[PDB]
Every structure is written in C-alpha cells, then in structure tokens.
Amino acid sequence: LALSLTADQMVSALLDAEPPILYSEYDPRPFSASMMGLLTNLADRELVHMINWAKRVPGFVDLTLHDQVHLLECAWLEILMIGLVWRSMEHPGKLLFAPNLLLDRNQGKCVEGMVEIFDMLLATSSRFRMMNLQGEEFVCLKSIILLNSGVYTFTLKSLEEKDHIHRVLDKITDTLIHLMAKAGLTLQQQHQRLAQLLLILSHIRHMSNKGMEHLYSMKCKNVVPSYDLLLEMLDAH
Amino acid sequence: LALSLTADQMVSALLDAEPPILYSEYASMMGLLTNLADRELVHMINWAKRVPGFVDLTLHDQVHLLECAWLEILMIGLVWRSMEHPGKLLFAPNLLLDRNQGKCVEGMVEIFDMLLATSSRFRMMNLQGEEFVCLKSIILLNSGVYLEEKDHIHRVLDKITDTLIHLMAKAGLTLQQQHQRLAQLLLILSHIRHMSNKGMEHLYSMKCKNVVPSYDLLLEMLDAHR
Ligand SMILES: O=C(c1ccc(OCCN2CCCCC2)cc1)c1c(-c2ccc(O)cc2)sc2cc(O)ccc12
Ligand SMILES: O=C(c1ccc(OCCN2CCCCC2)cc1)c1c(-c2ccc(O)cc2)sc2cc(O)ccc12
Numbered sequence: 391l392a393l394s395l396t397a398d399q400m401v402s403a404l405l406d407a408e409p410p411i412l413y414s415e416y417d418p419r420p421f422s423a424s425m426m427g428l429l430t431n432l433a434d435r436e437l438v439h440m441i442n443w444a445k446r447v448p449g450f451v452d453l454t455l456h457d458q459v460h461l462l463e464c465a466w467l468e469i470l471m472i473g474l475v476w477r478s479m480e481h482p483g484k485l486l487f488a489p490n491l492l493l494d495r496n497q498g499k500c501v502e503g504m505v506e507i508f509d510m511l512l513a514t515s516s517r518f519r520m521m522n523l524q525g526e527e528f529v530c531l532k533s534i535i536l537l538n539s540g541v542y543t544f545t546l547k548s549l550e551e552k553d554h555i556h557r558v559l560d561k562i563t564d565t566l567i568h569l570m571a572k573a574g575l576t577l578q579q580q581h582q583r584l585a586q587l588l589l590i591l592s593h594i595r596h597m598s599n600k601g602m603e604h605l606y607s608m609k610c611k612n613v614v615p616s617y618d619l620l621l622e623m624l625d626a627h
Numbered sequence: 628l629a630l631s632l633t634a635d636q637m638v639s640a641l642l643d644a645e646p647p648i649l650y651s652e653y654a655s656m657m658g659l660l661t662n663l664a665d666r667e668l669v670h671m672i673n674w675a676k677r678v679p680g681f682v683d684l685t686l687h688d689q690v691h692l693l694e695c696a697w698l699e700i701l702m703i704g705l706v707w708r709s710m711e712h713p714g715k716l717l718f719a720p721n722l723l724l725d726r727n728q729g730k731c732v733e734g735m736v737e738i739f740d741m742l743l744a745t746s747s748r749f750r751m752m753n754l755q756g757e758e759f760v761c762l763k764s765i766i767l768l769n770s771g772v773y774l775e776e777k778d779h780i781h782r783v784l785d786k787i788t789d790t791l792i793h794l795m796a797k798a799g800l801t802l803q804q805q806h807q808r809l810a811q812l813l814l815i816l817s818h819i820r821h822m823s824n825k826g827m828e829h830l831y832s833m834k835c836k837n838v839v840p841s842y843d844l845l846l847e848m849l850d851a852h853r
Contacts, residue, residue: 566810577802588810589765589784
C-alpha cells in the first residue's frame with residue numbers, strides 16, 4: 391500500500407519503475423520534415439513505456455481509470471521533457487533526444503518555431519547541472535509531475551481521489567527530504583533545496599505549454615494522445 | 628542590503644509593499660477587465676521595486692522579470708481576493724463574477740474554472756497573508772530567471788524559502804508539516820504558471836490591439852534614476 395511505504399521504499403519503487411532509454415534508427419541521416427518525423431516516432435514509442443512507468447508509481451493505480459487518463463493527458467509532454475532534460479544533463483549545449491539523436495541549437499533551427507523551446511530545454515539542463523541534480527531526486531520530481539499537473543482540473547469519489555493524490559505527494563516530499571538528509575545537508579539546506587527543485591517544475595510546465603502550442607501549429611492530424619488511446623494502454627485486461 | 632534582513636523583517640517588508648485593490652471603471656466584459664489590468668500594472672511595478680533585492684538587478688533584468696511574471700502576478704492576486712468568495716472571482720470589489728458570466732466570453736470559462744479551483748485550494752489550505760506575499764514574490768523572481776544576476780536572484784529566493792519556513796515554525800507546525808506545506812504551496816505555483824500560459828493564449832486569440840506590456844512601457848513605469 392502506497393501510503394505505508396517508508397522513504398527508502400518509495401525511492402526504490404521509483405528507481406525500479408524507470409523506463410528504458412530508447413533509440414532512433416540507424417542507417418549508415420541527417421535530416422531536413424525528417425527531423426520532426428524522427429522525433430514523432432520516438433515520442434510515440436516512449437508513450438507506451440510512460441504508461442508502464444505511471445502504473446508503477448506508488449498510488450497511481452489506486453485511482454480510477456478516468457483519473458489516471460486525466461493525469462496523463464495533462465502531464466505527458468512535461469514527462470517527456472523532464473526525461474529529455476535529465477538525459478541531456480551531462481552534455482552541455484546539446485539535447486539528447488536519443489543516444490543517436492543528440493542535437494544542438496542550430497539543428498533545432500531546422501524546425502520552424504523550435505529554437506525558442508530548444509533554448510528553454512537547454513537552460514533547464516544547465517540548471518540541473520548547476521544544482522548537481524541526483525537520479526533519486528529526478529525520479530521524485532517526475533512522479534510529482536504525474537500526480538500534480540492534472541489534479542487542479544478534475545463528486546464524493548473525486549474528493550477521495552484528490553485526498554489520496556495529496557497524501558502521496560506528501561510522501562514524495564518526505565522522500566525528497568529523507569534523501570537530502572541522508573546526503574548530509576543541514577535542515578536549512580534541505581528546505582532551500584526542496585524549494586529549488588520544486589520551482590523547476592514551474593519552468594517544466596511553461597515549456598510543456600509552449601511545446602504543445604508549437605506541436606499544434608504544425609497542423610498534423612495527431613498531436614495529443616486521445617482519451618481512448620490512453621484508456622487502452624491504461625485499461626489493461 | 629537585502630540579504631541581511633531577518634525573516635521577520637522580510638515579512639514586514641513584503642506586507643508593507645502590497646498594492647491597492649482597484650475598482651473597475653464603470654465585448655464590454657473584456658473591455659472592463661482590460662482597463663483594470665492596465666491600471667493594476669503600475670501598482671505591480673511599485674510593488675516589485677519594494678521586494679527585497681529586486682532593485683539590485685539591472686533595469687534590463689528587472690524588465691525581463693516583469694515581462695515574464697505580470698499575468699501570473701495578476702492571477703495570484705485575483706485568486707487571493709477571491710478566497711472568501713466561493714464560486715466567484717473578485718476581479719474588483721464592484722466586479723464579482725461567477726462562472727456563468729465567464730461563459731459570456733468565448734474561451735474564458737475553462738480558465739475561469741481553473742482560477743476558481745485555485746481559490747478553492749487556497750481556502751482549504753487556510754493560506755495566510757504572510758504566505759501569500761512570499762508566494763507572489765517568488766513568482767516575480769522565479770518566472771524569468773531562465774551569472775551574478777542569477778546568483779543574486781537565487782540567494783533572494785533562498786531567503787524567501789527561509790522566511791516561509793520561519794512563519795510555519797512560529798505557527799507551531801512540526802518539521803514534517805513545515806516541509807509538506809512548503810511543497811504544497813510551491814506546487815500551486817506550477818498551476819499558476821499553467822493558467823498564465825493558457826490565459827495568454829486566450830488573450831492572443833482575441834486579436835485585440837495589444838496583449839503584453841512592452842519593454843519601453845515597463846521601463847518607463849520603473850522610473851529610472853536620472
Ligand atoms: O519533438 C518532440 C515531439 C514530437 C512529437 C510529439 O508528439 C507526436 C504526437 N504523438 C501522437 C500520439 C500520442 C503521442 C504524441 C511529441 C514531442 C519532442 C519535444 C519538443 C521539443 C521542443 C518543441 O518545441 C516541441 C516538442 S521534447 C521531446 C522529448 C522526447 O523524449 C521525445 C520527443 C520530444
Ligand atoms: O481578463 C483579464 C485580462 C484582460 C486583459 C489583459 O491584458 C490587457 C493588455 N494589457 C496591455 C498593456 C499591458 C497590460 C496588459 C490581462 C488580463 C484578467 C484575467 C484572465 C482570466 C481568464 C482568462 O482566460 C484571461 C485573463 S485574470 C485577471 C486579474 C486581474 O487582476 C485583472 C484582469 C485579469
């Protein structure tokens with residue numbers, strides 16, 4: 391039961407749940423149309439692993455299927471983006487979409503309207519580096535995004551669901567504090583770092599919104615995962 | 628100067644810096660809201676200049692922070708004055724609107740509902756004025772912060788965190804409760820960013836004369852020394 395986990399058990403559950411790092415193809419490239427096709431193909435494959443990951447975040451499968459879908463509809467691009475930033479952290483000036491799709495700013499220019507968001511993503515990677523963000527902190531933040539982003543936009547059942555999400559979010563706060571304490575930070579340093587980490591989430595939200603507007607401007611048939619697509623992925627037998 | 632303030636001195640400074648509540652002057656609905664927002668802007672700049680550490684930034688950087696934060700700041704203010712009015716948004720004391728009135732503006736109701744939900748969250752948490760004033764200052768300093776200038780902003784942000792924790796400690800919260808409440812408050816800021824992004828998209832969709840305050844307007848309001 392999610393609310394019974396110790397901080398150590400929460401960390402271990404989240405690290406265990408992590409999705410794999412996917413590749414692009416692989417063909418002894420480059421890309422004109424082509425770059426967006428590769429990125430779309432990658433994102434579409436990552437979404438499947440994201441659903442698997444979400445179902446392993448403690449407390450998530452306790453929610454109704456409807457609410458699970460809503461949280462993912464709200465969070466999916468933020469989650470792709472924070473994953474991208476983490477993968478890119480050790481690669482100054484580059485975004486590691488995949489190990490074989492490692493792009494710089496000038497390659498971002500090849501997609502109309504992409505550079506400004508590319509720059510925001512690079513700045514977030516820089517911030518992660520400057521904070522020396524740890525993998526255990528990263529998995530906490532990604533779980534927070536999943537549970538928090540859609541909770542403000544959802545009856546008696548809904549009240550029960552929100553209470554549960556808030557309790558699990560509190561457990562994740564406890565877990566972040568535990569990690570910082572185990573690492574030797576003073577109480578003051580712990581609360582300052584907790585705040586610094588959580589403020590990053592506002593920037594991640596900003597980038598997701600700006601990215602979604604950009605995706606929509608491309609006039610493709612499909613931009614967002616539909617309710618029933620998420621449903622089927624989540625609505626397992 | 629600013630980084631030597633105690634937590635108590637920080638709180639007093641922020642409370643003292645609070646802008647006034649303006650009245651609406653009286654398609655019409657949006658005309659009224661646009662006029663109100665335009666008038667609130669100067670008062671926001673006056674407030675910003677009183678947030679400890681803000682005026683130590685270059686004017687260029689002060690303007691950038693305002694360009695990034697202005698709508699989030701209007702929104703958090705709206706949410707705060709609407710706390711004690713469940714189901715309604717108190718844009719002005721003479722402009723209290725419910726969601727049915729938000730429906731009269733094409734594309735507004737979705738954001739209206741988000742704002743109401745935020746006000747509802749504030750109510751449930753029993754958000755205090757001293758905490759509100761800290762959160763608003765964090766929006767100002769954090770929203771545009773994407774070397775010496777960034778370091779200064781981060782030191783000020785750390786002082787506001789310390790201040791928030793101090794307020795909680797004095798109120799008798801356990802260490803666990805302090806950390807949990809700090810997190811709860813900061814996560815609401817992600818929702819305020821979201822509402823500002825959606826609101827900006829909405830305002831742009833209206834195809835009015837103008838949406839964002841210009842660099843020159845903000846700089847003029849900041850009233851440079853001479
Ligand atoms: O390029 C993409 C991207 C491309 C297509 C996407 O969606 C394709 C539509 N697809 C439909 C079915 C459901 C899943 C989405 C999503 C992201 C990525 C990003 C992006 C960056 C800047 C910007 O302006 C817009 C997006 S960030 C990102 C991280 C990834 O791991 C993968 C792709 C990406
Ligand atoms: O309606 C407005 C609003 C109207 C016009 C605005 O900008 C007018 C352009 N003006 C140009 C010169 C610089 C200042 C802005 C900003 C907010 C307000 C809001 C809003 C809500 C929902 C939504 O979908 C969009 C906006 S929130 C708000 C809070 C206020 O204190 C005042 C107006 C408002």
